[model samples]
Target: DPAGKAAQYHKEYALFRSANMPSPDKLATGVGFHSFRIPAVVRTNTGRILAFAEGRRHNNRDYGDINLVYKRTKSPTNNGENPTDWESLREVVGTGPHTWGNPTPVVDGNTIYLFLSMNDGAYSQNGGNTLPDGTKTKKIDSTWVGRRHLYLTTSTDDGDTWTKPVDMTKTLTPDGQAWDAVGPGNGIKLSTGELVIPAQGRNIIGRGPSGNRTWSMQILKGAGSEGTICQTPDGKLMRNDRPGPMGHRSVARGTLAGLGPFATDNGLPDPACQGSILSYNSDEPARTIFMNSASTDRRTAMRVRISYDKDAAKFNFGRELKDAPLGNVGNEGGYSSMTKTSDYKIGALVESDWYEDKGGEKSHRCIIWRRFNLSWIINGPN
Candidate 1:
């Protein structure tokens, strides 16, 4: 029964793609984006699935005119098996030539809150750089125009629409930090009903009646970037992050009031890339799931692991995406985000460079939507 159930749930679909690739959403006709990167996802209270990414307008660099884009399920699928279930691509906030990236979304009741990091598109992270458009730019500084800004947007109507992004840079960001990044993945709604948005050197906690009416930042001293926050079965808040220079995933555990003393997990090898963690089930089985490019140097070999312990200290079970029986594996791994789908499946939005030229500079990177169950991971590769 487990094997049959695994086969029924294990599914993959091309969620987002470059202008050159064929997309399932014919209404979109492709967004004309040069590439898509930095995925984030969430399942709303209404059971709608929202998948987000940075719609790179020109080339696949971190900087430049990038807009936040997303697609949502027309309605909850049986197991998200239909590629045509997704609506046309839509932009959340893409106006002018500014860079809007790092989509970190969290849901509370009927409201969906999204956090993003913004910067002037003319300037790169480092000063004295030239763009493909033949424009000379200065390095990003602490000035209003050069500094990275934080913003928030919300949608009360499932995935229908969003409000104008409100700037929270001066308030949410710490003093003197010019460059910062949001989760680049989805945030978590703690058992206490508070939302935690993982960021560069700190974690942003949302409080108040709506769970996002107010916010506070907790500095994670020495912790790496692209942090993914989750609540372990032990009732402790855990932050699993990309170890910038180290060869392993950085981990820290504490409470909403504070989290620190970051340490490396030798069990989770990383190439300093963003990873996603989900508190799958805290009941009888008590399962915590993690997904990332499980390697020390390469970004391939994307694997998903499950930790059944109270503290999630070690992942006892795992399987690579290549192990799926679909025979659709290749150079397809990088930043990823995960969410428990309404259909009782682990739905993941993972980065893939399958269409990029292998020898030349990197090309348009797309995203793959993967849906599976615990049974699939436990059943092992085909």
Candidate 2:
């Protein structure tokens, strides 16, 4: 069912027939033309499998253009229907200066929210990927990759129409790091009804190669502009947290099993830290985990990280899940995203390629679905 190595775990994925069009006059493959990456699928209250994915016209960076495309299951029932037959895929916005990619959608009741960064340029020229000569192409914006900010758009009409893109820049900083806030955590509605957008920030501001050096910060519900200087329960100042310019962050995994011990270096919001902050989830409906791979060190790979909030009284900063290196077969895993299905199965599509095979990274990615019974995190009882 999966395009490549994914077929090994064929039992996990549903093979809707080879992509074909329902009508002869219609086009057969939108899946191939679309560099389908970083996708989020949300089931509607009315029972519709609505999906949104980052669609780039081609695999080439600057040579091609990127946009967000929407697709929905045609029939209300669940059968492995070919994408072309299941639903019609179309662009939410075709021609715009802002590249609307990196789709993470949150649907609440009937409202749906999508978050991503709009790049002034494409990944080909600026983004990093290896060339034949072993050189790396960096991800940059000719106009303003460094200054680009995060935008929030909502659709009340079932993905039919969206509200005007609102620039919800952090008022806390005079000039907040735009691309610094890489990912989003589950949104939690506090007891007082205020929505705490679980988010992170980069204390250092600059573009790719220049900006990889970043300091981390968290956002809380009522926390205002005057970011502080305090110590986390772990005893480290929040502002002191910075990136090493390398992909592998020395995160204290709960254990080697890849489960989270939730060691915060210090409890979040420490008195001596920059601020009493932890990554907060916005509010359900849109509360979901996301994955992102940033081009770190010009290694020609996106440093992949999966972020989820820790279970807290209100809601704590979620833990990050990294790929388990699969030896030579799975070398340098990157470009991955996941969505928890109501059916108790998680569909995790990873964009990676084998070393021995075709060029650097494969045009296609392997889609893997991992099933978690009551316990997916195989941690022994304390």
Candidate 3:
């Protein structure tokens, strides 16, 4: 039993890969995508694991013909030890020529809610030449020609199907805010049943019976672009976000009603990249887990840490993903998302760049789905 338990404690799989890579699992071939980026993951109420990413049809840039894609576990016991455990990649909202990305998903009862940031496919986030078709697009801004939009979609059948995306740009986006971004990660369902979607400059709170019928946005004063939220053991909503220019993470704590100002957590060093946090368990051992590229100027050395304190001010126990027994699995790390799996393991979808220092059309990105138990993390790096 110890041997089986140890094997289950830690496992990693290349869930999404570039089409140009060797077909180890045959999972990336049929998708017709050049690359995948911006991963978001969640465990459904039915115990199914759903992994979502942006299917870049052309190149790795943030723009141009990108689709919101996902793959659910074929069964509840699919722990992703085998690539076949995950069903074939499926598109959630890839209908038009627009970019559907930033998949922030939350689960309530049997329904799954997703938040996405959308923009014209021809345009890039900062304005540049679009890919695949070679069209110069305008930069995204406040005007109609380049403004970004927010949308929400739901799946009541355990990710088997999704409803048409409903635009929430007019109601949710803050006034005068030209550029907006959702978590590009997983949102948390509070202890009180409120669904909180972390986003740039704001936290979208869902109220009412279904948790999506009514919504409100809470301003995040000092937060940066990629927002990651978790409920601390003390019942406070903690925002540990990427600090645009600083080396440390921006930390803000508050409640559903409001959040306080942001401060930097010197214990958590960052390279201004997206990170993921989870309130692992609020009882007994009382712990919160965080994962990011633990560096000041680079997105390598992905590490996971645990904070036992109520406020989660400092992460006392930690381990590097590169030290896992499986060896270096695509060394580069960037944007990541985390969720507590039904089997009591932490499930993470982390970005791994095949083209680490390269940029533009040559850069290719994929996602590595890693599952590790507390024992493995507590054991420390090998």
Task: Identify the runs in model 2 with alpha carbons over 4 angstroms from their true place.
Answer: 1-11, 14-34, 60-64, 75-86, 122-146, 169-178, 181-333, 352-382
Model 3 alpha-carbon miss at residue 151, Å: 0.5
Q: Write the per-residue lDDT of candidate 3 for residues 1-382, one digit (tens) a residue.
A: 1212364377887888777676622234454777888999988878899999998877787888889999999997776657888888888888778899999999888889999999987677788675666678888888754778899999999999999999899899986677789997988888988889999988999987863458889876887778989999888899989898849899999997788889888999998889999998888778898999899988887889888889998895488888763433455588988888887889988888777547657577788988988877777744
Comparison by TM-score, 1 against 2, better one: 1
Off by over 4 Å in 1: 1-8, 24-31, 77-79, 325-330, 355-362
All candidates: TM-score: 0.93, 0.50, 0.93
Residue 157, model 2: Cα distance from true site in angstroms: 2.8
Q: Model 3, stretches more than 4 Å misplaced?
A: 1-8, 24-31, 325-329
Q: What are the per-residue Cα lDDT tens digits for candidate 2 across 180-232?
A: 33232222222332222223432212112211212122333222111211122
Residue-wise lDDT of candidate 1 within 122-239, one digit each (tens)? 8778766667778877788888889889999999998689999999988889888888888879888778878889998989988888734698888888877689899999899998
The TM-score of predicted model 3 comes to 0.93
lDDT of each: 0.83, 0.35, 0.83
Candidate 2: Cα lDDT at 361: 34
Query: How far in Å is the alpha carbon of 379 misplaced in model 2?
Result: 12
